[PDB]
Amino acid sequence: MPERLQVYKCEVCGNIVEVLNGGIGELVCCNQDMKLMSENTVDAAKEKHVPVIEKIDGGYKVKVGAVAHPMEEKHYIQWIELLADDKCYTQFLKPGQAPEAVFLIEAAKVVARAYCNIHGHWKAEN
Amino acid sequence: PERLQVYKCEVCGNIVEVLNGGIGELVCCNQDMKLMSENTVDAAKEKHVPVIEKIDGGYKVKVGAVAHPMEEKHYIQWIELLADDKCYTQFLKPGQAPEAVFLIEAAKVVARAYCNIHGHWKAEN
Ligand SMILES: [Ca+2]
Ligand SMILES: [Fe+2]
Ligand SMILES: [Fe+2]
Ligand SMILES: [Fe+3]
Ligand SMILES: [Fe+3]
């Protein structure tokens, strides 16, 4: 049963969606259950995938990760998301760009998430 | 589906937003999820079309020209601001004012809002 903020992927066609409103029905695509992309579950280099959160004037800077993650055509961070109270800010990225995002927001406690097309969903919090 | 589209299961109420497009049809409760196209539901536009106000360092968005209800069974579930490759979402709840403030640097933006009863709505500057 889907819950707000969960990210699901169809392993067949590649559709990836985020839940805005939950419910009882299971998400399906290409004749199979969409996969719940649970954070920090994939066996990949943590130093390149776990977001690093830096407090800045008026907000936060998030970089993926402690060591810059590749931003190649076949391997890159597709987006970085910042979660704070009832806010969900997303910055989509492209190969060639730096694996980082800046968010102007007033929130003491935040959760940063990032998604690698190959290595999945990752998160960190301050 | 395409990035940013919002789909709803008319049977159980699941609503999702596309982060990565693909060719497959999203399904829930044995039927294709419905694409919630903006400004298509027959509803009072003065209460659903987002009104974008430019402020120093960002934008203030209100739904709508006339404040939309924010009751337990009829309210604006979220307001979203689309700018460049950014998608900022502010979830709301009954009792709150149907408005949101986004600090961002962008001359052109698209504001969207979703009413649990009247669907998806948008406006731009
Ligand atoms: Ca979002
Ligand atoms: Fe990776
Ligand atoms: Fe409404
Ligand atoms: Fe359903
Ligand atoms: Fe699919």
Side-chain angles (χ1 to χ4, degrees), chain A residues 1-45 47-105 107-108 110-126, chain B residues 1-24 26-72 74-104 106-107 109-125:
Chain A
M1 303 206 296
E3 295 176 10
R4 178 173 291 177
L5 303 187
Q6 288 184 316
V7 172
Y8 287 82
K9 172 183 179 180
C10 173
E11 293 187 289
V12 179
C13 72
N15 275 338
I16 298 180
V17 303
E18 196 166 319
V19 182
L20 296 179
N21 196 80
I24 296 167
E26 297 305 315
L27 298 171
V28 176
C29 193
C30 295
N31 308 123
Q32 66 183 223
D33 284 34
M34 293 185 80
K35 177 184 177 182
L36 172 62
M37 305 308 282
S38 298
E39 304 97 312
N40 314 338
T41 55
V42 175
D43 178 38
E47 71 269 37
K48 293 179 184 178
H49 296 91
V50 175
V52 174
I53 303 165
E54 172 189 6
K55 222 305 164 189
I56 63 173
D57 184 357
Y60 296 92
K61 175 179 180 177
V62 181
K63 69 179 189 181
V64 185
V67 174
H69 184 280
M71 291 298 284
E72 301 295 315
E73 297 294 326
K74 285 193 176 179
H75 188 200
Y76 65 113
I77 300 306
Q78 294 188 272
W79 70 78
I80 294 175
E81 173 182 47
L82 191 66
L83 306 176
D85 359 280
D86 264 336
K87 292 178 175 57
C88 179
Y89 290 3
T90 298
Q91 168 78 71
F92 288 101
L93 304 173
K94 297 202 233 300
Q97 291 174 11
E100 56 178 46
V102 174
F103 302 100
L104 296 181
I105 184 178
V110 303
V111 171
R113 299 201 293 189
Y115 188 87
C116 171
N117 70 308
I118 303 300
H119 302 112
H121 211 188
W122 298 78
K123 71 168 181 178
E125 63 168 48
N126 73 337
Chain B
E2 305 178 347
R3 177 174 291 175
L4 303 191
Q5 293 189 314
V6 173
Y7 287 82
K8 171 179 182 185
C9 174
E10 295 192 288
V11 181
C12 72
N14 277 338
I15 300 178
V16 306
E17 62 166 349
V18 182
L19 295 178
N20 195 76
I23 65 177
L26 297 171
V27 173
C28 191
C29 297
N30 277 7
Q31 70 186 218
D32 292 2
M33 294 183 78
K34 182 181 185 179
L35 169 61
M36 303 305 281
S37 298
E38 302 97 315
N39 302 23
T40 57
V41 170
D42 184 359
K45 295 186 178 187
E46 79 279 5
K47 290 181 184 176
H48 298 86
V49 175
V51 175
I52 303 166
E53 184 194 328
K54 198 168 177 66
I55 62 174
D56 188 24
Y59 296 90
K60 173 160 179 189
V61 180
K62 71 181 186 185
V63 184
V66 172
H68 184 282
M70 293 296 282
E71 300 158 6
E72 194 195 330
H74 184 201
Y75 66 113
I76 300 303
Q77 298 190 263
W78 67 78
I79 292 177
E80 171 181 45
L81 192 65
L82 304 178
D84 299 308
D85 245 4
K86 293 181 178 59
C87 177
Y88 288 11
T89 297
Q90 170 70 70
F91 287 102
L92 303 174
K93 42 231 233 166
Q96 302 183 326
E99 54 178 36
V101 171
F102 304 97
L103 298 186
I104 183 177
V109 301
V110 172
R112 303 201 295 184
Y114 186 90
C115 173
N116 72 308
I117 299 298
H118 305 106
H120 212 184
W121 296 80
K122 71 171 183 180
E124 64 176 81
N125 67 344

